[PDB]
Subunit: 301 residues, 6 copies
């Protein structure tokens, strides 16, 4: 049946519009793709996806949209019906998109009130094979979300969107894949919102090199020099000027999308971080707060 | 049936006996109670338990015994009976104790192999009411253990030894009570071993002054001053010279022993620590390793 | 006689008006009450004082005014006379204030040249009983001032304004009260200026939570968490983006305004901080400097 | 009368003899002078004073004696009277010394219970002009004491022992000179005991070099590099493995012993430390405690 | 012949023009000389140099020009020929300057593409003797450059501009003097660019005082207090809000411009910093990146 | 000709015999091979080398010997004559060794006075293929020595011992190989001594897991985890309780012993460390000191 196949971008609503714009292009290593009096689009130098981040000047910080990819026009419609069947509020009907790089798609809110987008045939952008030591994002690695009822959110993603379970951290954190990457989405309990967005680095040396630039650029590592167990990926968390959290990650495991057997890792500090030599932890990072405007569009504000 | 009513003491086998010995009497705040060629006893100044810590000069660091209390001599026998039905290896029949403070007790191995002692009528010692600012322990607060089958270890503590579930952190960490204190035992997953032993302080002020003393003695706080959710107690974890970890804690809740309803807390950063302004994390503390000589007594080595 | 009964607000002239405006509403925990081109008003959520902070957009950082409260028009007129007798430079006569909240007051310069305001019947704002863990200020706790002639500055607060001495730190720091709070004003030797403004928290836990919210906002603790001796209050000092310092405090002793016996505390390490587990110290906060515009109203600039 | 003219040495009773004996010989920079079953003498390489530190294997830490120096054999006698006419218990009648280095002197307890010694003609030891960057002590700089009646205690020092006042920190800390150096003794209120013994370094560079050696050897600065105001000396406090604090100081001002005009400095953060760019503070060093065995010699234990 | 005899100023092209503007005035300690819509000039309070820093609102941070001094209007003409004969691209012919303080000079590019300026007779501005503890720059100390062919860059500076070599750190870093100071210029390997601009402090104390100010102002010492071996000057590096690095330096030796003989220090860990006690290190500072627009003026952009 | 093919072990004369001895078996990860009252041999678990570390109880710390390995008995004699010719002071004539493991070899002093040993047929010990995450050493990676005439000391290793140059850091640090490993020995300017010994780890993960064990053992990283340029090896430096420095390293390049072209890297922060996010640096490690007893065997003492 038709399913989500990748993540496209994350649209942010940010107060400190300018500070956040400079961050992504002069600090985080993303490539500007376009600006407008009220918006800004950036893209990952190592991927052909039109844009991976969208910034909209707003009166408050929030996540406007989480855009997922579908293979074809007939796949976008199938998920359109599937979402309806599951009882979701549909904010838009499948049609050519006026947003950058066009594409055919629709929008619907998740059972929690977070706006999502599913689209196909979105224009492609440039893409080069990065050399080692550049310290810049190759592509998006994953997105982590909080949910008031995570078990159900996990099922929506599996039964409606087509994700499959790759791992479990006890019974509170689930890792979901929609292709051969260990996971592209991770669901966690808490108020309906987004926790962080990770970016894939070419190598461990690159994550370090990037973390280094971020340090001199005045941003310290919120939780760094670590390596997770579920997915076995190295990590480095940061807080953007806008107050969001972004992560440089690397070496996430490749699996067989169709046959990977998930495991239930037993919680333990060593399980969250197998290195235990960096600084900070999940406590030095912002505390989750319900995303402003649940079931509301960026417009409605 | 009858049940365990309190914790008496923990017996440690230590490699650097001399250094460990000087730690408890001159840094930690315990009162020397007795000594000999290969052993040393210590008691908390604010409680009349004959002694709360016993050290044995050994070749390898380990836990020799976790000593528990029972109200009566026939309570000790009832517990000998329970253990038998649970199928535990009994190391001693209920008899008069030759250990300091005497008493009537027996020893049995928990399903994982750690050695426990259940006894009653142990000679009381000297006790006095501490004054704010002394910065010394009042009595032992709790003991946390790791178990390869933590669900079973919990049922053992509740069904065999009569403890009761006071709280849960997900499905991986359980808090058990044997009296009005929120807990005296907490089970956690991992190889069969003892995580740490906590000592109750008179006030948050005494934990701070205590932590201060340790700091000037050369011992840094392993997990900065904080406050847990389950039990609402403040904490300060330290590593001893023998490599064991001890914690100064305060304000542990009081509950009705029978009517207290337990809760399942959702794992979250701010759940392990509601303050989040100290240094360290469980990661700066030793990784759990199986206790040397499972199902073996001190004689074994 | 007639006297000052409490603190109202503190008016600041800030060069970086926007960063300071954002600091109070999004980090410090105060409630915005009004804004115009060159001004911003903030209120403490746990008190009905119309506003506790006023910020004026300025070319240079300074303290524009420290407003105090009196019980009634009569009391204010009386104090106004008292001020004259003590030979002070009066900047206005008892009249209906035109600032937000209204009221009946007048302004005058302390013997040192700092502008103070005494007023009565200022409108009452809304007030809320905070819940533990919110980490936001309940009310203004105290204000510390520097005076070239502290011995005299104290006499002026006691004899003209009615404040009474609650304690002395050796012979250089005096704590003064004007109600049941140990103190609302403290006098320290140094150029004529304002040292810090302290905000009272519901509990020590709340102080810690506030400190944590600030840590994730990127504002480190200037003088780590501690507990003072005089007044027995816990403290957490911070440097605002505007350059001033603010403090989260709690557990400030309550005393009988009339019969409280003051003590002279002998200066010592353990006297400034009875905990000694945090970081920083007075040596790590900005050095006091004469307040710009002595004996000059904010107009003058 | 005649007067004390210089500090000779300090004698400590240390529980952890070995550790401390190692400290001074390899880490601190003092050259050994002679050993024995329970005694170790140490010398400062840049001064002819036979030995500046005496260690005695004891059960609990304590100050056994603070050895001072007199010029002639008869100046001693002239003091033995002053002490008598002061009412001090005398522990030794002027007699030829049986302690390493010989000499003639007596022992008596001061008004607070700390044993002092006054001698003359002790055998000089070797001395070489140290070179910049060696990072070892040149001689002892000063000793700071704690007194329950510091005002009287100072008068004892000035009137009975012949010291003069050089500076006052408010009314709680008095600097006393017995020669050219700004001070060799400083008095602080508190339980009767020694606070720290400070050694002089050839320069600021040597202090840092010195601190650098202590750091690599595992001893962190208790009170970071700073510059005191009273005396204008750079500082660096440390904690010996025995629980005693020592200091590497430099650039202590020289004054005319006779005419030096003393000043009363106003207490202030910037006063204790004019640099304020390091870590620690009195806060992070041992809290004072009554010296064990008041009015008792070491032979009493 | 005629030769450069001093450094005048550095002109930066800054993106966050206002943040950098405020840094030099409010934080770094320079004095505003003038401004217009797109430029700001700053002056050292301790040097008659008209100005030592120029900022220009730019799209991207870069070095716009490095201004040098010549003694006479004919020296400038001479250097204008030497530069020509060396193959340097001349950006302007020797004439009266239209920049503040005027003067007579011209602009040419060094062999690597950095725009330089040589001038004479520039108007002197205010000047005064700083007092110990003021914590502000006296004048400019030195400027460090990165060159892809530093051996050639060194020869350019000596054979063309008239600089002399005062020292070598191995064979990768050169120290050049234009007057009595050990060096005003230092060449290092790497892409063509400016490493840092260092400001002279009255004394080591001032550097500490200065650094403490940046500390409370929210700027951490990028490379802790230390002392270099070449020049023996104490150092403290910082990262400006603009992204450039500036250092407070003191005690840089003096030398006989004519006779001084250069040494070749053997690299060694402890040669870069003879104290090795401060925090950070060259690793916490930005990595050298070719100055944007080599061989192009600020206009082209 | 016949040449050195590997590093066997290092013998240290350590004053704190018991601490250093505990270090290697309970902290560093080496396995005890032998013991008596004043000696202790240690073995690396991933190599069959009989023992790689030797401790000798001593009055002063020093490098007793640096034992190299030759392929055969004849090979050994060849080198014995080859050493004879270079003019070294032989200390033993080729012959069966009474030391653990036996073998045939001799000891001679290098031009700088360090005592070396070249033996063959030393008894092989047990070896295990470690699994990822054990965090224990596999083998000895390299040894770094200081030389007052480093240039000649290199020719000695290449022309006399048979090593080959794999790289140079500027003209001060040389990297020598005796097989396919990028290097096994590194020479650096300085007083004749041993800088540090490095231990190869199975992977970067194991070094991190190793550094974590040392952290919880109270032994912090002297030079934060990083990555060298020459050899591309990841690093982690530590100071042992005895005062020596050990390094956990990984990913050192494998090269072709014969056809490997070396390079001269230009010194520069990013070259010493390509990551730049750990702590400390060469400066936070002990200063090199001439080795006690130059040209003298352990027996002299
Ligand atoms: Mn992640
Ligand atoms: Mn605990
Ligand atoms: Mn305060
Ligand atoms: Mn001192
Ligand atoms: Mn410099
Ligand atoms: Mn190495």
């Amino acid at each position: 049946l038709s399913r989500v196949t990748e993540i496209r971008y994350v649209g942010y609503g940010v107060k400190d519009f300018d500070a956040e714009k400079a961050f992504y292009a002069d600090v985080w290593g993303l490539e500007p793709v376009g600006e407008d009096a009220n918006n800004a689009w950036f893209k990952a130098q190592g991927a052909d996806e039109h844009h991976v981040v969208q910034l909209r000047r707003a009166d408050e910080n929030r996540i406007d949209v989480i855009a997922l990819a579908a293979d074809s026009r007939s796949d976008v419609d199938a998920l359109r019906a599937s979402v309806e069947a599951a009882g979701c509020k549909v904010a838009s009907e499948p049609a050519v998109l006026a947003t950058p790089g066009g594409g055919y798609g629709f929008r619907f809110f998740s059972p929690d009130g977070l706006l999502f987008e599913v689209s196909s045939d979105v224009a492609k952008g440039a893409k080069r094979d990065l050399a080692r030591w550049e310290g810049v994002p190759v592509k998006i690695s994953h997105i982590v979300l909080h949910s008031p009822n995570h078990q159900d959110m996990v099922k929506f993603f599996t039964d409606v969107l087509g994700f499959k379970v790759s791992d479990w951290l006890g019974d509170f954190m689930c890792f979901l894949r929609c292709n051969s990457a260990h996971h592209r989405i991770a669901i966690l309990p808490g108020p309906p919102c987004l926790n962080h967005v990770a970016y894939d680095m070419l190598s461990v040396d690159d994550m370090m090199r990037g973390a280094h630039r971020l340090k001199v650029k005045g941003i310290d590592i919120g939780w760094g020099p670590g390596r997770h167990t579920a997915g076995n990926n190295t990590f480095s968390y940061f807080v953007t000027p806008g107050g969001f959290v972004t992560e440089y990650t690397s070496e996430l495991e490749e699996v067989d999308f169709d046959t990977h057997q998930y495991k239930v890792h037993v919680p333990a500090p060593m399980v969250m971080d197998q290195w235990g030599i960096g600084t900070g932890g999940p406590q030095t990072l912002p505390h989750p707060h319900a995303n402003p405007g649940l079931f509301q569009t960026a417009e409605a504000e």
